[PDB]
Amino acid sequence: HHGKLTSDFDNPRWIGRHKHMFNFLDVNHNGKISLDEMVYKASDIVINNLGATPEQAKRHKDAVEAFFGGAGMKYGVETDWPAYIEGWKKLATDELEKYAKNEPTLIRIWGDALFDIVDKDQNGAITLDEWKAYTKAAGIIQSSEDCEETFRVCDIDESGQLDVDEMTRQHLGFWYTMDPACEKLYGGAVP
Numbered sequence: 001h002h003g004k005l006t007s008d009f010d011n012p013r014w015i016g017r018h019k020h021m022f023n024f025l026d027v028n029h030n031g032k033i034s035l036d037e038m039v040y041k042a043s044d045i046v047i048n049n050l051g052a053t054p055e056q057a058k059r060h061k062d063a064v065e066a067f068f069g070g071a072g073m074k075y076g077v078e079t080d081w082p083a084y085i086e087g088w089k090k091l092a093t094d095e096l097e098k099y100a101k102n103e104p105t106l107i108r109i110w111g112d113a114l115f116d117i118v119d120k121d122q123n124g125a126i127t128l129d130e131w132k133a134y135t136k137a138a139g140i141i142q143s144s145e146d147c148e149e150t151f152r153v154c155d156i157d158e159s160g161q162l163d164v165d166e167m168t169r170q171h172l173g174f175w176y177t178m179d180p181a182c183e184k185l186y187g188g189a190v191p
């Protein structure tokens with residue numbers, strides 16, 4: 001056993017995982033979010049908190065734009081919760097096809113662009129401090145204990161590096177397939 005290629009869209013925990021993220025993204029409790037806000041947030045984090053160059057920020061923005069665009073979000077459009085989770089079925093389906101065709105997934109392309117900013121050595125592997133810095137700036141994780149759970153789930157020691165390759169596997173299983181080996185990837189921060 002090496003992974004999982006089947007979706008699990010009727011699992012209430014898959015829906016609730018993305019409901020948690022929709023609420024985390026819906027910072028003004030409008031019940032709706034826009035692609036404008038998603039790409040603003042992405043560039044706000046990497047430029048203003050993580051010291052990214054304009055070129056790095058552009059690469060990272062294009063990756064985030066394509067990712068939420070793959071879930072049906074568009075510029076100038078407010079996406080409510082039912083439109084969001086329905087669009088995420090399409091995003092997860094299109095990603096699993098690329099995954100199964102051994103094509104670079106949208107989540108992998110996002111990871112490359114992000115690791116080039118977060119990793120000071122820029123070889124595609126991040127330290128535990130670098131993962132704490134990214135997730136706490138984004139807010140997806142608040143406590144350092146949850147950041148350590150990421151290293152436990154990726155079977156990397158806390159003193160080691162986290163590569164895009166192992167992270168992509170866990171993220172595909174955490175967001176797309178409900179892979180039981182990827183549970184607790186964000187500790188207690190994300191159901």
Ligand SMILES: O=C1N2C=C(c3ccc(O)cc3)N=C(Cc3ccccc3)C2=N[C@@]1(Cc1ccc(C(F)(F)F)cc1)OO
Pocket residue numbers: 017018021022038039041042045064107108109110111112114138140163164165166167168169171175
């Ligand atoms: O994957 C991730 N994220 C996933 C989600 C998310 C949002 C909504 C939703 O419904 C489901 C998930 N949000 C965020 C937070 C966010 C949202 C908007 C703008 C800026 C930040 C997020 N940051 C990520 C970045 C990342 C991507 C790829 C890889 C890999 F593995 F490829 F190398 C590792 C890490 O860190 O984990």
